[PDB]
Design a protein around this ligand. Structure first.
Ligand SMILES: OC[C@H]1O[C@H](O[C@H]2O[C@H](CO)[C@@H](O)[C@H](O)[C@H]2O)[C@H](O)[C@@H](O)[C@@H]1O
Length: 548
């Protein structure tokens, strides 16, 4: 049965293939980076913060065992400047992450070994920000918790030492980030470890919310990201120059007009721009929006390219609402409703946080919600106007819990039909739109968040329907492509003419979706029954379970 075959592969072979753990021997296997080709990328390299002498010894000694790798270890400055990262552009490296202390019981000798984590797979050998929530959900269903806990330990380390949750842990990501899930990601691992019963669980919960509170204040509600007028946050990374990790050809088309304006060859224009010599304001802004699109994880989409820096997205501000609610709960329970940030000595109560979320919910509705169309749009903070682009991320409002019941149903009735395709939810409506993250492409995170969001607001029959559509499409591809799991899916079309690891959040979308399926539906999936045929075959009251 292909449903059980795919599931079984995801739970065992796939996650193991994607799992990474740093020991002394595997460095340079973990440090492999194909995305940046340049003379500095030939030898493996790791960067370490100035706070971690013990980690420095670990990796330094790692180079001493296997000089074959020619691995180079380098400390990092206490203050990491945008200019500084531009300097390591041509000499990249992997960033150290959380380490687990393991003591010899007889002789007490302490050895360091990395916490486990999952990579998205393939070209991406690093821990990524918003993939890791998706994967951790799937790993907790596969009952590998240590892999999920490791990533939480990593996000904590990322926030303290690197100042935010990184797009991924590499030199060239140090100014970027990605949509925050840390609060909810901490809760689901807390509950799996046994909750308050487990003292290690409670410890972890506190450290993750301590870090979450700092990420909130110092990153997302700080400037430049925070818009003072609206009080809503935008994606505004401080990265400088042209991002190294793209294709050498990638930007050549937009750069070429500027080079001709400056009368030099493009390859010279590239170098002189990265040397700061050319000052072009209009182009400096473009690359600013580019880095903002890469911080949104949606690179690339038409609602963003040339648009989103100034944009306050339903995406980010929804996940912030979840942060504010989660933080409030944490303080009221474990902090006795009094929390004083040890950094700035700021006292806060749950009532205050619960307040802050109420204002956010008000201001989101003010600047975003549209009752006629049923969508949450994004607000441009520069020109002070609302976007017309209909996006699938509007369901994050449900996932966060900031929408009113009235908003939700108007959104289910009016908004959902335009996003619901054969394979589930397209990333945006056809009218709103060949880019990557636009129609006709569905993406796993969009599905996962909408499933749980729709469930919280009381529609799980819609989730059953949308999950069937997605799992059917994934199952048919598994059998038609002979075990190949593909990263991207066209939800409006059918099949076509190393997948041993799959792709992390696609794997997780499959299992998370199957929880919503009863045994009748799982069997229909094994037969590769299309949704139209499956639904029409059900007794009318069973068909109600799918919202039909
Ligand atoms: O072209 C390089 C870009 O790759 C990443 O973005 C993709 O990979 C991530 C992990 O799969 C996803 O979270 C993301 O949604 C994808 O768009 C990276 O995030 C970008 O910064 C790179 O520029």
């Amino acid at each position: 049965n292909p449903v059980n075959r795919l599931s079984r592969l995801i739970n065992t072979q796939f996650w193991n293939s994607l799992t990474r753990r740093v020991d002394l021997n595997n460095v340079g296997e973990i440090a492999k980076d194909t995305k940046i080709d340049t003379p500095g990328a030939k030898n493996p390299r790791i960067y370490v913060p100035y706070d971690c002498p013990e980690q420095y010894e670990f990796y330094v000694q790692a180079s001493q065992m296997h000089p074959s790798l020619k691995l180079e270890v380098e400390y990092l400055p206490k203050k990491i400047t945008a200019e500084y990262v531009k300097s390591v552009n041509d000499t990249p490296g992997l960033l150290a992450l959380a380490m687990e202390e393991h003591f010899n019981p007889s002789t007490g000798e302490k050895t360091l070994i990395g916490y486990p984590y999952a990579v998205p797979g393939g070209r991406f050998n690093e821990l990524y920000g918003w993939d890791s929530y998706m994967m951790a959900l799937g790993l907790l269903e596969a009952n590998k918790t240590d892999v999920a806990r490791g990533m939480v330990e990593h996000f904590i380390f990322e926030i303290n030492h690197y100042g935010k949750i990184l797009n991924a842990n590499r030199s060239y990501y140090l100014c970027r980030s990605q949509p925050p899930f840390l609060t909810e990601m901490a809760l689901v691992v807390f509950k799996k470890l046994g909750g308050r019963s487990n003292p290690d669980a409670v410890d972890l919960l506190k450290r993750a919310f301590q870090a979450s509170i700092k990420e909130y204040k110092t990153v997302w509600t700080a400037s430049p990201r925070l818009d003072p007028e609206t009080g809503l946050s935008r994606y505004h990374p401080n990265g400088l120059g042209i991002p190294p990790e793209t294709e050498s050809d990638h930007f050549d088309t937009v750069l070429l007009p500027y080079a001709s304006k400056h009368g030099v060859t493009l390859d010279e224009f590239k170098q002189l721009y990265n040397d700061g010599k050319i000052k072009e304001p209009k182009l400096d802004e473009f690359f600013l929006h580019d880095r903002g699109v890469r911080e949104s994880g949606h690179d690339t989409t038409y609602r963003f390219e040339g648009v989103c820096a100034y944009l306050a997205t339903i995406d980010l501000n929804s996940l912030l609402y979840k942060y504010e609610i989660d933080i409030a709960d944490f303080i009221k329970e474990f902090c006795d409703d009094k929390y004083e940030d040890p950094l700035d000595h700021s006292i806060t109560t749950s009532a205050m946080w619960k307040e802050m979320a109420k204002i956010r919910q008000e201001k989101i509705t003010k600047y975003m919600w549209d009752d006629e169309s049923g969508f949450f749009f994004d607000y441009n903070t520069k020109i002070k106007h609302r976007t017309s682009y209909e996006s699938a991320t509007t369901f994050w409002a449900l996932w966060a819990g900031l929408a009113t019941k009235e908003q939700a149903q108007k959104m289910v009735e009016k908004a959902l039909p335009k996003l619901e395709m054969l394979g589930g939810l397209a990333a945006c409506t056809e009218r709103s739109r060949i880019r990557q993250w636009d129609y006709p492409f569905g993406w796993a995170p969009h599905q996962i968040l909408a499933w749980e969001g729709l469930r919280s607001y009381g529609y799980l029959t819609v989730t059953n329907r949308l999950a069937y559509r997605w799992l059917f499409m994934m199952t048919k591809a598994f059998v038609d492509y002979n075990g190949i799991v593909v990263e991207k899916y066209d939800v409006t079309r059918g099949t076509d003419p190393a997948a041993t690891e799959g792709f992390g959040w696609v794997n997780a979308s499959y299992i998370l979706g199957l929880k919503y399926m009863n045994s009748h539906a799982r069997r229909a999936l094994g037969a590769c029954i299309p949704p139209i045929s499956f639904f029409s075959s059900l007794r009318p009251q069973e068909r109600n379970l799918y919202g039909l």
